[PDB]
Amino acid sequence: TTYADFIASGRTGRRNAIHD
Amino acid sequence: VKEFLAKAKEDFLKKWESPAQNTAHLDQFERIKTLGTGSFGRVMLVKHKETGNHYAMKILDKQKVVKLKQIEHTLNEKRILQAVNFPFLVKLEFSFKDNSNLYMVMEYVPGGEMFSHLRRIGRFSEPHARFYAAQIVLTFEYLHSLDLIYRDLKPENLLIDQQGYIQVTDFGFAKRVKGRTWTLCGTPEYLAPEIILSKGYNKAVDWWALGVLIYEMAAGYPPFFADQPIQIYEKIVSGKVRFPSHFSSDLKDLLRNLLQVDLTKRFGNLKNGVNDIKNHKWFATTDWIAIYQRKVEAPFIPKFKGPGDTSNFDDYEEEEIRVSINEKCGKEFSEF
Ligand SMILES: Cc1c[nH]c2ncnc(N3CC[C@@H](N)C3)c12
Known part of the structure; x- marks a missing residue:
């Protein structure tokens, strides 16, 4: 499922602001 | 309306x-646990020694902020927070700088x-x-x-x-x-x-x-x-x-x-x-x-467990606050 895909991605934690 | x-x-x-300036000092607060960490700063749970009230204190290393070209963004943050007022925006309660850091102390929001x-x-x-x-x-x-x-x-x-x-x-x-x-x-x-x-x-x-x-x-x-x-x-x-x-x-x-x-x-x-x-x-x-x-x-x-409960928040590893003995980024933060 898409959620299944989400859970196994490497972006499931707190996400940080982008720098430069 | x-x-x-x-x-x-x-x-x-x-x-x-x-804008309000320099309205508390570090040594008026007991630092407890970090409640979150960012790209630029970290926020700690905090107890004001005199009233005993709990707050969330954002700490910003002046030198890290100059490093990541976040000066105007940091001056923007304080200036705006002190200037706004709306139910669903957190109150800023105190702010101040010492030799090494910017500090913004806000209402503690306990639900995580x-x-x-x-x-x-x-x-x-x-x-x-x-x-x-x-x-x-x-x-x-x-x-x-x-x-x-x-x-x-x-x-x-x-x-x-x-x-x-x-x-x-x-x-x-x-x-x-x-x-x-x-x-x-x-x-x-x-x-x-x-x-x-x-x-x-x-x-x-x-x-x-x-x-x-x-x-x-x-x-x-x-x-x-x-x-x-x-x-x-x-x-x-x-x-x-x-x-x-x-x-x-x-x-x-x-x-x-x-x-x-x-x-x-x-x-x-x-x-x-x-x-x-x-x-x-x-x-x-x-x-x-x-x-x-x-x-x-x-x-x-x-x-709710009490004043000063942080079970709703994840644990972070700590880093101690070093203040330097000589001032660190004078004119850049003159207005903070
Ligand atoms: C920033 C802040 C204000 N009041 C708070 N109360 C609890 N936690 C906070 N932080 C934890 C995660 C950060 N995103 C901000 C705050």
Whole structure:
């Protein structure tokens, strides 16, 4: 499922602001 | 009731021109646990020795801030926070600098970030997402009317208070923008296409971010995800969205007019303004007035254990605060 895909991605934690 | 906004703009103008400075010192607070960590700073739970009241204290290393070209963003943050006033924005209570750090002490919000609740339970129902979304609409209406654009909407920055209502924290990217601005900043998943294409952009990026928030609240995942930021960037600038099968058709509709690459066509940025949002089918049962007044029953009211409980928040590893013996970034922060 898409959620299944989400859970196994490497972006499931707190996400940080982008720098430069 | 646009006289509310007129008075709100006059207070903001006055607090903008002449900002409070140096209204507490480090040694008046007992530092407890870190409650979150960012790119630039960290926030600690804190107890004011004299009243005993608990706060959240953001600490910013002046030298780290000069390193990451975040000076005006940092001056912006303080200046704006001290100048605003709205139920769903966190109060700034004190701010000050010592040899080494900037400090902003704010009201303590004990329910933890939406982010953690949302990840644990997968997703929120539509009436719940709607209730959270309404608070953000009202809050964006307010800040945009002061020519303020927020720029970091995300679950991580939305804390849940004791009544179960949102408090928006982290104004690191909040800027007072006449017309247009250009800094590439934000959080990859939440970035509007304009920002990515280095276009130069207006308050409509917050309405974009609002569509993402609502997608994520109702989907349990963001509409554009991949393992690296540049790849998220491609998904975003395609303008190619798929909704889960369970999204109501009203929600699909609202999200398509919010997740809209074409500015001439984006809700928020139109003849009718915010009312395209407020008056839309999916917000139809929302009492906007009862929301502002917090008379609506909240999706959920967080577990209370006491003054000074942090079970609602994840644990972070600590780093001790070193103050230096010689001042560190004088004129850069003269105005903080
Ligand atoms: C920033 C802030 C103000 N009040 C707070 N109360 C608790 N936690 C906070 N932080 C934890 C995660 C950060 N995103 C902000 C705050």
